Amino acid sequence: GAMNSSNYAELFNNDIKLFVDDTNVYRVTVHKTFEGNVATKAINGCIFTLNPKTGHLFLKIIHTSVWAGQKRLSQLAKWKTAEEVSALVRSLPKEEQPKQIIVTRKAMLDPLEVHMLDFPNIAIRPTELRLPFSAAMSIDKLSDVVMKATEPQMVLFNIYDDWLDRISSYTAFSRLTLLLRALKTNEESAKMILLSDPTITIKSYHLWPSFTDEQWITIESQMRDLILTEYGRKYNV
Amino acid sequence: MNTVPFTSAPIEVTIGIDQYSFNVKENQPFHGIKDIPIGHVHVIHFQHADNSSMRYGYWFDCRMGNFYIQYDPKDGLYKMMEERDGAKFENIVHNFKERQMMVSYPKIDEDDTWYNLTEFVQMDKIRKIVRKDENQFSYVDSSMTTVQENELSDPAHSLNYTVINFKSREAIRPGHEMEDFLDKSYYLNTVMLQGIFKNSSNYFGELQFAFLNAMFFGNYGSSLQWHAMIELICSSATVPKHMLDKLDEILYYQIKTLPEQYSDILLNERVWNICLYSSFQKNSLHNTEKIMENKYPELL
Ligand SMILES: COC(=O)CN1CCN(c2nccs2)CC1
């Protein structure tokens, strides 16, 4: 069934699972035409498929050519996501395939279920959590690989960098979702928080700065303040 | 015209014959039903006065033998049986017809209702859905589950309707997932019509037989099967034009006949709103949509 606050520790047990987010698969800019009508222009996209235990991120880049000559693109985008997730699972060795796939939006359930009929043992689940994975495109190195791609492409990342050396997957996921929530509520403030001090760098093989434990506590505190703030600024409280 | 003799009516019962029904009192001098139209299947059905639980009944065709009802006091129900001895059946039937102890099947001459509800239903197909080969008639009741219901528990007492499941490998061609889920024409025309049913007449017969079992026995899995078969057509972009025309007639008479007070349990809001207003065939069921809007606008 659904994934919610009551069964949250299930994400960090030893059953392989994947989160699938499709919010950045079909992306457009809207503009005016010379005749004063409106038109969209698509830009590159990506499926965000994450193992929350390990931090492994399978980023499938969705090049704009896949939309050429197609109709009802927002509906097709869901089916294309399910087609790509299904293809990924089939490419993994059997002991690497997930036992559950949790989708962040309920419109992905039927598309994914139909694409995965060959895998009756893999449970396809929704969630009640309002997870901030749409903000993945605010992570600079991820945005950059998507925008540069000239063809369909899969890139592999670890979204926790080396954090699991020092913390559990439950704390790494909490850290990630606080960072993404912040980036989604106010990207500019969030990014200033992360990069202000120039003596803390992002290693070439990482996505985030090389903070110490103490510095992560400070950083984490500053992200909470930002989120509560914006929530006042937004709700005047 | 043919006749179903009752040995006797020991327990107070409401008796149904097709869309007609009448009350018989405990130990009333009732000896059965006459002037039944030849040419159609028929259903004779029962609801005890003491226990409104378990509606039950028998599908039969008088061309296939001489049948009578005899109350069994051990099993507690009106049982249909076949008399092999023809001359001896004629004597009994003639004796009660002289003594006027039978109700006449009350068909109005203008009235095509039963023909319209049963146009494609055949006894031979009924007997494949209801497996009890030693009898020429078929027993159905409220509680019998379907083959698909048992997959989701006595197999001998089941309704073997054709399993339809929109999220199944049968329904979905590899590499056509989105096409086949959003447009079910492959599943309808190739898998079901060409492959399983062979023609649309057999398809329409099962659909009519499921509706009738839903309406007369309140059989839930039958209702499920009737809606599934409507939805498969309404959700296919490509359907032969003759099939749409007959579907509209079929459902029209089903909707006309449904008791008004049973609409809340026999009609599935989602399926009907989808079928009439969202599906490929939203504009192809003129008679059915008009009767539905004028009789059950609440559901829509
Ligand atoms: C050997 O046992 C019997 O013969 C008993 N039956 C006689 C025929 N009975 C029928 N009623 C109407 C048509 S046939 C029912 C009872």
Query: By C-alpha distance, which of A64, A80, A62, A78 is closest to A155?
Result: A62
Shared-domain flag, residues A121 and A94:
yes
> Would the CB of B183 count as within 6 Å of ligand 1?
no
Q: Which helix (H) or strand (E) holds B150?
A: helix B147-151
Atom of ligand 1 minimally distant from the CA of B70: 15
Check which CATH number belongs to the domain holding B200 and give it: 1.25.40.550
Best mutation target, A117, A118, A124, to test chain B (most B CBs within 10 A): A117
In a domain, A102, yes or no: yes
Shared-domain flag, residues A118 and A212:
no
Tell me the CA–centroid distance for residue B105 and ligand 1, in Å: 22
Shared-domain flag, residues A55 and A92:
yes
Domain's final residue, options A139, A163, A187: A163
SS3 state of residue B59:
strand
- Look up the domain containing A204 and give its range: 164-237
Q: Which two tokens stand for residue B257?
A: 């006949």
Shared-domain flag, residues A46 and A152:
yes
> Would the CB of B89 count as within 6 Å of ligand 1?
yes
Neighbours of A209 (CB within 10 A): 17
> Would the CB of B5 count as within 6 Å of ligand 1?
yes
In a domain, A193, yes or no: yes
Atom of ligand 1 minimally distant from the CA of B85: 14
Tell me the CA–centroid distance for residue B83 and ligand 1, in Å: 7
Nearest residue of B to residue A120, measured between CA atoms: B168
Alpha carbon separation from A97 to A55, B3, B209, B249 (Å, rounded):
15, 66, 45, 50
Please answer whether residues B41 and B63 qualify as being in contact, where contact means their C-beta atoms are separated by less than 8 angstroms.
Answer: no
Q: Which two tokens stand for residue B199?
A: 């023609």
Shared-domain flag, residues A173 and A152:
no
Shared-domain flag, residues A48 and A156:
yes
Please report the resolution in angstroms: 1.7
Best mutation target, A72, A78, A114, to test chain B (most B CBs within 10 A): A114
Backbone dihedral angles phi then psi of residue B192, each to the nearest 5 degrees = -90, -55
Nearest residue (CA) to ligand 1, atom 13: B89
> Would the CB of B243 count as within 6 Å of ligand 1?
no
Query: By C-alpha distance, which of B117, B106, B80 is closest to B21?
Result: B106
- Tokens 């990482």 correspond to A206
Please answer whether residues B5 and B41 qualify as being in contact, where contact means their C-beta atoms are separated by less than 8 angstroms.
Answer: no
Which residues from B are below 8 Å from A110, CB to CB? 167, 181
Number of A–B residue contacts, CB under 8 Å = 21
Q: Which helix (H) or strand (E) holds A30?
A: strand A27-32
Query: By C-alpha distance, which of A222, A170, A161 is closest to A194?
Result: A222
Tell me the CA–centroid distance for residue B107 and ligand 1, in Å: 28
How far apart CA B109 and CA B121 sit, in angstroms, is: 21
Burial classification of residue B185, based on how many CB atoms lie within 10 Å of its CB (0-12 exposed, 13-18 middle, 19 or more buried): middle
Which residues does B166 contact at the CB level (< 8 Å), separation at least 6? B181, B184, B187, B231, B232, B235
Shared-domain flag, residues A131 and A52:
yes
Query: By C-alpha distance, which of B209, B226, B207, B208 is closest to B265?
Result: B226
In a domain, A3, yes or no: no
Query: By C-alpha distance, which of A158, A69, A161, A81 is closest to A115?
Result: A81
Shared-domain flag, residues A159 and A228:
no
How far apart CA A49 and CA B255 sit, in angstroms, is: 48
Exposure string of B261-281, with b = 16+ CB inside 10 Å and e = fewer, is eeeeebbbeebbebbbeebbb
Shared-domain flag, residues A123 and A215:
no
Please answer whether residues B249 and B284 qualify as being in contact, where contact means their C-beta atoms are separated by less than 8 angstroms.
Answer: no
Contact: B172, A113; criterion CB under 8 Å: no
In a domain, A126, yes or no: yes
* Chain breaks of chain B after residues with C–N above 2.5 Å: 152
Q: Which two tokens stand for residue A179?
A: 């960072």
How far apart CA A159 and CA A53 sit, in angstroms, is: 11
Please answer whether residues B75 and B5 qualify as being in contact, where contact means their C-beta atoms are separated by less than 8 angstroms.
Answer: no
Domain's final residue, options A138, A163, A188: A163
SS3 state of residue B47:
strand
> Would the CB of B6 count as within 6 Å of ligand 1?
no
Q: What is the DSSP letter of B157?
A: G
Check which CATH number belongs to the domain holding A50 and give it: 3.30.420.230
Tally the domains of chain A. Answer: 2
Check which CATH number belongs to the domain holding A170 and give it: 1.20.80.40
Query: By C-alpha distance, which of A45, A55, A13 is closest to A177?
Result: A55
Distance between the two ends of chain A, CA-based, in angstroms? 36
User: How many residues are recorded in chain B?
Assistant: 300
Shared-domain flag, residues A140 and A175:
no
- Chain B contact present for A110, CB below 8 A: yes
Nearest residue (CA) to ligand 1, atom 12: B5
In a domain, A4, yes or no: no
- Chain B contact present for A230, CB below 8 A: no
Nearest residue of A to residue B165, measured between CA atoms: A114
- Look up the domain containing B155 and give its range: 116-299
Neighbours of A122 (CB within 10 A): 19
How far apart CA A208 and CA A55 sit, in angstroms, is: 13
Please answer whether residues A108 and A78 qualify as being in contact, where contact means their C-beta atoms are separated by less than 8 angstroms.
Answer: yes
Helices B200-217, B241-257: axis angle to 10 degrees equals: 10
Shared-domain flag, residues A148 and A68:
yes
Query: By C-alpha distance, which of A173, A194, A167, A186 is closest to A227?
Result: A186
Contact: B167, A114; criterion CB under 8 Å: yes
Domain's final residue, options A141, A163, A185: A163
